[PDB]
Chains A and B, each alone.
Chain A
Amino acid sequence: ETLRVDPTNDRLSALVEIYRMMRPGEPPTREAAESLFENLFFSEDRYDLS
């Protein structure tokens, strides 16, 4: 039932919505969103669980 309140349908719309959340006020492109999401939790130089 969670799946039925999403406005998203595939990877690109999801990345665009995360980008709209983190940085409101400009439309993203196909590379800015992917890089921003790849920087959050999946890059050893901006994240470190001790």
Chain B
Amino acid sequence: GRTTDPVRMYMR
């Protein structure tokens, strides 16, 4: 998904 950050994965 072109990202590995879990804070962005949460806020999305």
Q: Do A and B touch (CB < 8 Å)?
A: yes
| Chain A hits for B9, CB < 8 A | 25
Judged by a CB distance under 8 angstroms, whether A7 is at the interface is no
| Chain B hits for A26, CB < 8 A | 3, 8, 12
Q: How many residues of B contact A (CB 8 A)?
A: 7
Chain A interface main SS type: loop
B residues sitting closer than 8 Å to A (CB atoms) are 1-3, 5, 8-9, 12
A-B contact pairs, 12 of them (CB 8 A): A23-B8, A24-B2, A24-B3, A25-B1, A25-B2, A25-B3, A25-B5, A25-B8, A25-B9, A25-B12, A26-B3, A26-B12
Closest 6 CB pairs of A and B: A25-B3, A24-B2, A26-B12, A25-B2, A24-B3, A25-B8
